[PDB]
Amino acid sequence: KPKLLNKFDKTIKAELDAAEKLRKRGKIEEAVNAFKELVRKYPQSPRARYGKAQCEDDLAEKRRSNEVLRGAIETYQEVASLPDVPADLLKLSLKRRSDRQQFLGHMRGSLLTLQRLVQLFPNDTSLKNDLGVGYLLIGDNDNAKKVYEEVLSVTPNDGFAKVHYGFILKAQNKIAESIPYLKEGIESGDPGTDDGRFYFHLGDAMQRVGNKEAYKWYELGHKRGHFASVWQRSLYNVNGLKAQPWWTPKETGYTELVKSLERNWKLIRDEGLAVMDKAKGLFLPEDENLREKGDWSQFTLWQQGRRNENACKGAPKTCTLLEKFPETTGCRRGQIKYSIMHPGTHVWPHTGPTNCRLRMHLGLVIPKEGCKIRCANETKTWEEGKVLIFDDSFEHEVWQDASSFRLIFIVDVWHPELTPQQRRSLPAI
């Protein structure tokens, strides 16, 4: 290689090299000071400014400090404001700025930086691809879709753009349309396409249209390290946790919780029925595109280890009962919720995002016929007042063909083999 030195910078290369050598040798504090001195003496030097930013970046890593990193992010921008900045340096500085803004969770800031990059380098397709990711990270699928449509208009066979366009189409329930983009994108082998998210959604789109090739893609995704197995396809995992579709209470160790749910199941049922009868708007329809058809709604008391205070006003005894069990109330990768499903419902085969939880189901109102749940290769039914336990990281599927409603209580627990240290440090999902 990159050309990072402007005319003046070539005249001070000896000083610039001396400072960078300190950085490369790990003398970060000395390197910071060396580049700070260069920025003082040569305030317009783009290479000196970039060196200062790189040292602040390394220092932020050394001190694990977001504030130090915020300084680097500003200095990376200062490089771009200086006169006569070489094109290669301008791109490197603003790209790293955007990347570090994303690390900090400053997604709107990264977006503005990525927008500037595309304006400065209009023919760089990689930068537009990066802008699309910026929109995806903030949840703006509509603008991300338009970015990848622009990329595919000029480079139709860009595989990064194909898989991401396919991902967006799938999210919008354009299943058939998404398959060729996801498939051709993965097959391109372009950098960024060998990603478990695209294998996950290609196979799922294929399953939804009845394409039996789905599991060849799950097999390949497993062989390439994205899935623990063809059946267990979660992407936010702690490696090595016991992997089994169905669990007994004793196997989980959470026997006191299970005893409490089964001994007190009728109070849990009754509060759920009262909400159905007098506060039915607390049941929210499932909103993750997991239904082929039918009506399925959830009343959530806990999510991400956080109690919903207003919801617990609707099930106060159930919330009081459950507060004695932090193995569920503190499961920041699970929920506690009522789940109602009505006749004519089919839930698509799907997997949850993480192997770090197990999912308990307490039967509350179970019709005598028509309701069942498959996990992996094994299908079961619910019983009123009894707990079933499965690992939702394994593919599972549900049918409701009874002649009345089916109500269960879903209680997520931390995987029993996760230590307290792990349970405290895993990011919430």
Partner: peptide, 18 residues
């Protein structure tokens, strides 16, 4: 949106730096 029950979002965790 949150990845409550599937993997429908591009990312399922929040970004908070160090």
């Amino acid at each position: 949106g949150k990845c409550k029950n599937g993997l429908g979002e591009y990312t399922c965790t929040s970004l908070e730096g160090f």
